C-alpha cells in the first residue's frame, strides 16, 4: 500500500494521479464512512481519503492562474484520520502538512 509522503509524491509525479488505494471524501461517505465513528478502515478496507480539491482560501499554498490544488491523506491505516496530508497542484508541485493544514512545507 502506497501511503507515505515519498511513495505518494513519487507516484503522483510519475503516474500523475493517486495510487489505487485512494478514494474521495464523497466516495468514502457513500460507502458508509462516518467521520465521528473513525470507521474508514471498516467500511473501505485498505483505503485512504484523497483526490479532493483543496480550496487554499487562506493563500498558504502558492497560487497561480490555472493552478488547482488537491489533497490526499498520508500515513493512514485505521481509526480516525490523522493530521498528515499531501497537497499536490495541477502543475505537480507537492507540499506536505503534518499539523492539519496549519502549515505546509514543499517536498517536490
Amino acid at each position: 500500500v502506497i501511503n507515505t509522503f515519498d511513495g505518494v509524491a513519487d507516484y503522483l509525479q510519475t503516474y500523475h494521479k493517486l495510487p489505487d488505494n485512494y478514494i474521495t471524501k464523497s466516495e468514502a461517505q457513500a460507502l458508509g464512512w462516518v467521520a465521528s465513528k473513525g470507521n474508514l478502515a471498516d467500511v473501505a478496507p485498505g483505503k485512504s481519503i484523497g483526490g479532493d480539491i483543496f480550496s487554499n482560501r487562506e493563500g498558504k499554498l502558492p497560487g497561480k492562474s490555472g493552478r488547482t490544488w488537491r489533497e490526499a491523506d498520508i500515513n493512514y491505516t485505521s481509526g480516525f484520520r490523522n493530521s498528515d496530508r499531501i497537497l499536490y497542484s495541477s502543475d505537480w508541485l507537492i507540499y506536505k502538512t503534518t499539523d492539519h493544514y496549519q502549515t505546509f512545507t514543499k517536498i517536490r
Side-chain angles (χ1 to χ4, degrees), residues 87-105:
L87 275 291
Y88 56 100
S89 77
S90 43
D91 55 347
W92 304 108
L93 285 181
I94 309 193
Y95 283 73
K96 99 171 213 207
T97 171
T98 50
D99 67 357
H100 244 119
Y101 315 101
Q102 292 178 87
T103 64
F104 297 96
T105 52

Side-chain angles (χ1 to χ4, degrees), residues 30-97:
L31 288 166
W33 169 55
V34 175
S36 72
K37 306 175 159 178
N39 67 353
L40 178 57
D42 297 313
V43 307
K47 312 301 210 212
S48 304
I49 303 295
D52 291 306
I53 277 157
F54 178 75
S55 304
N56 192 33
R57 281 158 196 172
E58 305 300 1
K60 302 205 184 167
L61 297 175
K64 187 176 157 173
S65 325
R67 180 177 289 151
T68 62
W69 287 98
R70 293 173 189 277
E71 67 157 290
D73 280 31
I74 291 288
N75 295 326
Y76 180 75
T77 55
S78 73
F80 289 95
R81 298 169 68 193
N82 61 26
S83 60
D84 290 352
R85 304 289 178 268
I86 188 165
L87 275 291
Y88 56 100
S89 77
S90 43
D91 55 347
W92 304 108
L93 285 181
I94 309 193
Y95 283 73
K96 99 171 213 207
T97 171

